Amino acid sequence: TYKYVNLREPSMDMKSVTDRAAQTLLWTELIRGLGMTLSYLFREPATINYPFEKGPLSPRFRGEHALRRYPSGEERCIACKLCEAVCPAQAITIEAEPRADGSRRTTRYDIDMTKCIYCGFCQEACPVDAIVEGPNFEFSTETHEELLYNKEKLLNNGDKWEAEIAANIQADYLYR
Amino acid sequence: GVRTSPTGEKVTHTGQVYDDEDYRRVRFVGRQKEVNENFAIDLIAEQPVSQVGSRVISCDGGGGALGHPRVYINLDKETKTGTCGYCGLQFRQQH
Amino acid sequence: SNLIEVFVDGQSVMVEPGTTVLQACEKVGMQIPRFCYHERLSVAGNCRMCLVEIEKAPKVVAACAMPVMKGWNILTNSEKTKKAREGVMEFLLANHPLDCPICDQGGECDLQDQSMMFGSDRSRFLEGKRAVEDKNIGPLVKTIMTRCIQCTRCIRFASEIAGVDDLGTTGRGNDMQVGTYIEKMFMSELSGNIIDICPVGALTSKPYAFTARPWETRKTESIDVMDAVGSNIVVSTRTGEVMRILPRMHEDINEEWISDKTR
Amino acid sequence: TRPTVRPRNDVAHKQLSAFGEYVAEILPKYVQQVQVSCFSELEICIHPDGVIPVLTFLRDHSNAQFKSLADLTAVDIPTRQNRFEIVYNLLSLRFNSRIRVKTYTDELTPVESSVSVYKAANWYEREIWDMFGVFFANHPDLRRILTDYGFEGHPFRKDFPLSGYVELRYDDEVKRVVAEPVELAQEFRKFDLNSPWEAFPAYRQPPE
Amino acid sequence: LLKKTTGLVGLAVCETPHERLKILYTKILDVLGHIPKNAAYRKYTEQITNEKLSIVKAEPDVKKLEEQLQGGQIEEVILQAENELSLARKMIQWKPWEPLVEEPPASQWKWPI
Amino acid sequence: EDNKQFFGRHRWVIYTTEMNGKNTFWDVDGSMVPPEWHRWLHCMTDDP
Amino acid sequence: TQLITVDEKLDITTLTGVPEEHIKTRKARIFVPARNNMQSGVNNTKKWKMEFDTRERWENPLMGWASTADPLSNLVLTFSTKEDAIAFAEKNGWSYDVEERKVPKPKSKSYGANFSWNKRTRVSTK
Amino acid sequence: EMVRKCDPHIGLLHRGTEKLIEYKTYLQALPYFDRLDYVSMMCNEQAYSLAVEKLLNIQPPPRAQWIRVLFGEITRLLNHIMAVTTHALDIGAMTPFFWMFEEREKMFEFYERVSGARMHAAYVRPGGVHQDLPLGLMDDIYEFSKNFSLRIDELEEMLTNNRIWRNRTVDIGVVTAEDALNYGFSGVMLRGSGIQWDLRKTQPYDVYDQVEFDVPIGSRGDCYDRYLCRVEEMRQSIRIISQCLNKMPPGEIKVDDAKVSPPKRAEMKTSMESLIHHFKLYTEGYQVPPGATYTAIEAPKGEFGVYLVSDGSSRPYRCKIKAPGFAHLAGLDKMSKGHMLADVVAIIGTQDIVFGEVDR
Amino acid sequence: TSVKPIFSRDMNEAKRRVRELYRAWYREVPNTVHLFQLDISVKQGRDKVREMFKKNAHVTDPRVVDLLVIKGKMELEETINVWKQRTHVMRFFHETEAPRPKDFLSKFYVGHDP
Amino acid sequence: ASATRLIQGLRNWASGRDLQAKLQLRYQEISKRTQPPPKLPVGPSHRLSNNYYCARDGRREAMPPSIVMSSQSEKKAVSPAPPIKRWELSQDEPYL
Numbered sequence A: 001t002y003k004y005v006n007l008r009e010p011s012m013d014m015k016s017v018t019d020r021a022a023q024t025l026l027w028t029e030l031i032r033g034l035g036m037t038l039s040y041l042f043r044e045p046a047t048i049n050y051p052f053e054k055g056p057l058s059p060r061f062r063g064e065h066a067l068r069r070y071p072s073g074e075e076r077c078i079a080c081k082l083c084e085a086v087c088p089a090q091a092i093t094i095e096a097e098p099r100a101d102g103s104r105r106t107t108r109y110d111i112d113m114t115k116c117i118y119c120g121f122c123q124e125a126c127p128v129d130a131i132v133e134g135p136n137f138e139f140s141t142e143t144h145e146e147l148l149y150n151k152e153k154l155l156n157n158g159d160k161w162e163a164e165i166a167a168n169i170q171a172d173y174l175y176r
Numbered sequence B: 001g002v003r004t005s006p007t008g009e010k011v012t013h014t015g016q017v018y019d020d021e022d023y024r025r026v027r028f029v030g031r032q033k034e035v036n037e038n039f040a041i042d043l044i045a046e047q048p049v050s051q052v053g054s055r056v057i058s059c060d061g062g063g064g065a066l067g068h069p070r071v072y073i074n075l076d077k078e079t080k081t082g083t084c085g086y087c088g089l090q091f092r093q094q095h
Numbered sequence C: 001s002n003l004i005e006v007f008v009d010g011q012s013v014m015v016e017p018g019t020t021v022l023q024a025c026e027k028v029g030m031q032i033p034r035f036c037y038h039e040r041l042s043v044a045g046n047c048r049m050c051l052v053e054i055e056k057a058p059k060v061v062a063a064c065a066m067p068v069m070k071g072w073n074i075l076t077n078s079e080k081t082k083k084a085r086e087g088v089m090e091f092l093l094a095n096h097p098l099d100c101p102i103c104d105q106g107g108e109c110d111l112q113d114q115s116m117m118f119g120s121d122r123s124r125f126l127e128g129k130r131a132v133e134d135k136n137i138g139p140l141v142k143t144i145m146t147r148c149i150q151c152t153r154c155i156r157f158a159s160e161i162a163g164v165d166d167l168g169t170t171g172r173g174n175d176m177q178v179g180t181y182i183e184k185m186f187m188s189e190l191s192g193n194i195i196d197i198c199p200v201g202a203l204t205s206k207p208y209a210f211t212a213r214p215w216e217t218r219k220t221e222s223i224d225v226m227d228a229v230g231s232n233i234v235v236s237t238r239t240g241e242v243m244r245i246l247p248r249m250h251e252d253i254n255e256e257w258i259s260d261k262t263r
Numbered sequence D: 001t002r003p004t005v006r007p008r009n010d011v012a013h014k015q016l017s018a019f020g021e022y023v024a025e026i027l028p029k030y031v032q033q034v035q036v037s038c039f040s041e042l043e044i045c046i047h048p049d050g051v052i053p054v055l056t057f058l059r060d061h062s063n064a065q066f067k068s069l070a071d072l073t074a075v076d077i078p079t080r081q082n083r084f085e086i087v088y089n090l091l092s093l094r095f096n097s098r099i100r101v102k103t104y105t106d107e108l109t110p111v112e113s114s115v116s117v118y119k120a121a122n123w124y125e126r127e128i129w130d131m132f133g134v135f136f137a138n139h140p141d142l143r144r145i146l147t148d149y150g151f152e153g154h155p156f157r158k159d160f161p162l163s164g165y166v167e168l169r170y171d172d173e174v175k176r177v178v179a180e181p182v183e184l185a186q187e188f189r190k191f192d193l194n195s196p197w198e199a200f201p202a203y204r205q206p207p208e
Numbered sequence E: 001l002l003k004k005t006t007g008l009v010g011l012a013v014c015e016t017p018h019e020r021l022k023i024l025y026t027k028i029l030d031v032l033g034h035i036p037k038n039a040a041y042r043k044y045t046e047q048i049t050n051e052k053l054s055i056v057k058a059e060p061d062v063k064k065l066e067e068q069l070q071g072g073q074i075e076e077v078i079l080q081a082e083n084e085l086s087l088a089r090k091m092i093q094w095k096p097w098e099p100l101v102e103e104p105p106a107s108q109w110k111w112p113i
Numbered sequence F: 001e002d003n004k005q006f007f008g009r010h011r012w013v014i015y016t017t018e019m020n021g022k023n024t025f026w027d028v029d030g031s032m033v034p035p036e037w038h039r040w041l042h043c044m045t046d047d048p
Numbered sequence G: 001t002q003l004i005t006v007d008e009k010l011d012i013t014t015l016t017g018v019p020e021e022h023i024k025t026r027k028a029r030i031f032v033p034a035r036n037n038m039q040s041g042v043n044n045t046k047k048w049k050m051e052f053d054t055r056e057r058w059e060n061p062l063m064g065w066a067s068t069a070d071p072l073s074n075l076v077l078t079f080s081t082k083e084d085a086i087a088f089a090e091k092n093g094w095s096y097d098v099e100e101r102k103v104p105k106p107k108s109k110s111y112g113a114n115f116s117w118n119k120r121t122r123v124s125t126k
Numbered sequence H: 001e002m003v004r005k006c007d008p009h010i011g012l013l014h015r016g017t018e019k020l021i022e023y024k025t026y027l028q029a030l031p032y033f034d035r036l037d038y039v040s041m042m043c044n045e046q047a048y049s050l051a052v053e054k055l056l057n058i059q060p061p062p063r064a065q066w067i068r069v070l071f072g073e074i075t076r077l078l079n080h081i082m083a084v085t086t087h088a089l090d091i092g093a094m095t096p097f098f099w100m101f102e103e104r105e106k107m108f109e110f111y112e113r114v115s116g117a118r119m120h121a122a123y124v125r126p127g128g129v130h131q132d133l134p135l136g137l138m139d140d141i142y143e144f145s146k147n148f149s150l151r152i153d154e155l156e157e158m159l160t161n162n163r164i165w166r167n168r169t170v171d172i173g174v175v176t177a178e179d180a181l182n183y184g185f186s187g188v189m190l191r192g193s194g195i196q197w198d199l200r201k202t203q204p205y206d207v208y209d210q211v212e213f214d215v216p217i218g219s220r221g222d223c224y225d226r227y228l229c230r231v232e233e234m235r236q237s238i239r240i241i242s243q244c245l246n247k248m249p250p251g252e253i254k255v256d257d258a259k260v261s262p263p264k265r266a267e268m269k270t271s272m273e274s275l276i277h278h279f280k281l282y283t284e285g286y287q288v289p290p291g292a293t294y295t296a297i298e299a300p301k302g303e304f305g306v307y308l309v310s311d312g313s314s315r316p317y318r319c320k321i322k323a324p325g326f327a328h329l330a331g332l333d334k335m336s337k338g339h340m341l342a343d344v345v346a347i348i349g350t351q352d353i354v355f356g357e358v359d360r
Numbered sequence I: 001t002s003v004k005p006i007f008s009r010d011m012n013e014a015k016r017r018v019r020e021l022y023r024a025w026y027r028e029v030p031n032t033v034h035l036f037q038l039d040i041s042v043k044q045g046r047d048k049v050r051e052m053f054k055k056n057a058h059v060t061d062p063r064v065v066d067l068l069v070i071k072g073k074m075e076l077e078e079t080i081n082v083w084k085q086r087t088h089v090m091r092f093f094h095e096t097e098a099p100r101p102k103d104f105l106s107k108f109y110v111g112h113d114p
Numbered sequence J: 001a002s003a004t005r006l007i008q009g010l011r012n013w014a015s016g017r018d019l020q021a022k023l024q025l026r027y028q029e030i031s032k033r034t035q036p037p038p039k040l041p042v043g044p045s046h047r048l049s050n051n052y053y054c055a056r057d058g059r060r061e062a063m064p065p066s067i068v069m070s071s072q073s074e075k076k077a078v079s080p081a082p083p084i085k086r087w088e089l090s091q092d093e094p095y096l
Ligand SMILES: CCCCCCCCCCCCCCCCCC(=O)OC[C@H](COP(=O)(O)OCCN)OC(=O)CCCCCCCCCCCCCCCCC
Pocket: F026, F027
């Protein structure tokens, strides 16, 4: 149930001693290492051509956040603050009130993307599939406050990415 | 259903707009105020009221497990339609 | 003294005659679960959540209503006490609406909390739930009567403390509903306190509606100044804004109630 | 209770109770409590004068041979007058077993350093100086190990706030990273999460 | 048979393990006789040292002595005998069979609080 | 597509030379991909 | 001997690294928290709590977040008794004030009192 | 040239992790463990999960245990690739770094297919794992495992018999067994000295009593035998991965206590009790019974343990994190005496040191 | 009331350790101003040393002043050995911090703090 | 895979291994990116009868630690467990 790495007593007959002396003087293992490096020289490299070729992902991927809507235009978020209660970094700030037709809707849904740890506890806490952590990872900014998302930015990300987000959820909701 | 303040600033679906004498409009100077122009309160009001023949209807939002939790809406009041508390879809007993 | 000796899980406790089973268990630091019992209202005994096994008795007793006899051993944590609690919680949650996200009582719900602590983790109810017509009792109490579990704390508060006699039960069986039966407006000076003692989110605060949520609120203990009663209150805030005002229990002032101006 | 319940290990529970009796009767001068949890771990709660006599014993007794110091810990419990609880976690590779030696101190009483028993402790209790302010007498090089060099206070005390009292920023006037009294653009939102209902009646404390 | 390596780094092979174990166990009993008889450390260590010394006196083979002392290699058995000797010499100076030096405070080990 | 390429080279995009008014001839951008092709290009699905 | 006698009052304010502003201007409050009247459970009224006086929370100009300058704003300490909390407040130099534990008084309950012959304590409904 | 004293000043990544754990629930404090030993993410997830489950008196289902052991050995491959290849990159062998980080990239694709994140998965949770394996994942783990032995073979072709690599590792950092036990070393740092100790054998957890593997034991205590032990632990990890792929059982992946593990979203949106349990597990969290455990696993750096103290609430009272790098870097000063300045980088290599778990 | 000491049996040995620590800081300050190349004077750094000693001059407990001497020796050891940078030495001099309002009236003007 | 046989033979000779049987670049052998929809099993607690929670309540079977000795014969010396059994050398590959 165990093995001894490096417990070989080397043979001391003239054959093996001459083999080790030929290895020392004629550099046989150094040529072995050069041969392995030469063997990688003629392999095809593993380099994809970004931006034109993209790394492989899956529908579970946790990227840029988005607020979703129903298939009627009504937003799914009903202000229950489960996402900001489960949020391990407290990135989500929510304020709510009843709007003009008496629905329970938010008036503040902030996600600080520079506190966010991108773990997706918010999208699994969410009982209506309102918040998701979508598929976008290419959203780097030149300014820090451009990563302080409000409700308008998250709803625009949902409107922007819904055609992909809905198909990823369609691929993955049976595991959830 | 966006509208505009007299300062030329868009008013959000919440109703947020800065005052004229508020300095914090300077953050949009040379840039843009990002609002979403699909107001959900105007979009759910475009949905037609569903006529049903029962007294209690169930609603899950459509999609089954992809919608909201399935709730049960009573429809005894004929003065008012019965609204889903999650999705806002409204129902009427046709009798 | 004429104190009788009873036993809560074998622990001897000396109680006054007339003490219920629930109070005798309170005296050893155990809290029997309850929905219709309230220590400032009359005993109802109609939610059956407080059913507890007295040993050598082949029937659980409603601990909120049953007085202790001398020599009882109240088994607060025996197997059939727990089976009684899970069965009664299953019937309370059978017709209850899946409204916990859109409900103001969420996070501070007795039904949620002692569903977690005393009932089963899942459902066997494969049927359709009832849906109760809402009522309009004023601008202070939002009324969503599908969430009602028929504990009648409405009616005992309005009859016994507010002294109003406008709330009641109409109908019979599973179709029994709580309300005024007419379009009548429950506006007492103590009308908002029915928001406090409703264990579910069937009666909620219409001004406070949807704005906050109990875990994120900070609880500052403070004094009412709307009158010279000096009611003890909790100003619950959230991020530097006053969210609502609850009562504090003070036995000598405001026992656990506040007025509607205070609230 | 087959599928979802953790199966109880009664053999290890019996063996750890017997070895706890063994330690409690070999060392009555220092051992205050001996307990075994329901998940079968042995805690030996001792007096702080016997850090070196107990831990040497467990390191050197032929029926103990706790040759490994896994972890050394302090726990701040402010309602205790000896608010710091020093926790040694020991591993016997010979007897394939773990023991826990717990003791106590407050801010002013020094604990004797266990570096002469286990050299492993040399940084660990040094961390206990840095995080808690528990002083260890006869330590070789006792100083801070994890906090910044000008740090005031001991962070893992529970009366110490989550953010500090100072925060750093670069200041272009003095051309220097500077420390200033902390201001947060968003305050840490305290959540009161505890349910008002009792969860575990086996752990119910008796009333006053 | 002259074991070539113990396998453990820094733990050299003992040439005469039985004589070393006999000297260490009798020296442990010599040190351990200076402890009072009501001290449980004396009784337990005399008991296990007599068991180990009887097993050493009843087995000529090194391998079988390793299998029935049940402590791995014979050199770490020798090291544990030396550790027990050093422990007994320290336990004389500590005197830890005495009563408890001080009671804990009343809620010192009460968890939870 | 080229399914003879190894997994990562087997799907690619040649970006447009003009998108939303910007001259993207040399300034190609990874966020120029619309979301309906973003599943296929990032191999979230087999289906274009 | 190996023990010294210190008759002085216990004070560790110079050792805890706390700035003086958050020692001599803060008012610790030692209290058992009141039961939330939304609920009937009493498991939060079991322990003593030390909180502090709330300081200024203001609006963040960028996001509207609640910005604070109070380090002791989220500091709630838990104690088993009142005297432990008082000893811990005095040990750290915090000027404190103590509210007493308010228990609910023993009520007199009777289900038969709902149906009296002559008393006002009859129920008119059930 | 000689090193007389080595004084490692640390705390440059002390982020106050385990004070931040004290204000967060058990689910909320799980993703701090992804970031301590941040090349060994799901192993630290497993150690914290086993600590919480030991305090909760519940156990994961068998398929969860097999998934945890499968991804623990994938994680062990990740960490030993990082360890061997950066230990060679610091010495100067920069090429097997690049050769092995493609296999490393494919295992990060395995993490991303099973959780959605390439590194910090938050996938192993108290109660089991968060989500089941997607269809087709185990076939690709088989296609990886079928080829990874040749990658180890060409790594070992570059470094092992190379005389320059042996001159940088053969008499360097020699630790005796008694000093390695006394300094609190664990893992390869013990087993390089000949100490026959692996926690997956001696104090076994989830299904390691049901997988069959060997334990590489060194004989000289040097950097070279610790290198060979990590290469052979990659070999034996491939062996465990094959046994996990063949013996993966059916069944659920969370514990079926909905007061601990959250229910499925299909029954959360249908059943009242499941919605209540979903609500309370994602806002309050489950309550852990009061007690203090010390739960330790054989992480690829050594004994990784948690001393976890619950007071009854849904948040930990205390969470001490025992990491191997703390004791190993405390032993750095002994291991570098009588050596040279370019030997200290080999000693900081052979102690697999990641300062997230050193400084917390 | 009978407690275990740290180094000092009473306040005399304790004041002796305080006095030796002040001697060591007074000797160290010119080397600190030189090798950190501070922009202060030796008089100013020695006044900061005297300020940090006279801040804690109200303490009457031997164990507390033992721990204060221990922490002062740790500060000095981190200053003699160049473990602090210039920033850590200059954090004693709150240079970028605006002066706080000291009287009642300006504290009333600027905000709510007592 | 697209390498010619001369470069393939050179590459296999220089590595000393057959590099086409085990390519480190992935091809059509890997799984499809679109899969059939799963159907996950439910646990043992998905029963409509004999499924009371108190008969499977793990968290409420945890007891406080049994206090073995508190300070308010010729009995055998004990160890915390039996001594560890010596590990057996591998039959698979002992390197011996
Ligand atoms: C009076 C008029 C003249 C005034 C003085 C000018 C002197 C000559 C300077 C060179 C010509 C000016 C233009 C310089 C390049 C500007 C255009 C440019 O950068 O186009 C972008 C294009 C590549 O596009 P990009 O977006 O970078 O690629 C993304 C990847 N697809 O980029 C390319 O396609 C490559 C651009 C190459 C730049 C020119 C070649 C290198 C410099 C040669 C001259 C200097 C050599 C000095 C000696 C060097 C050492 C030997």
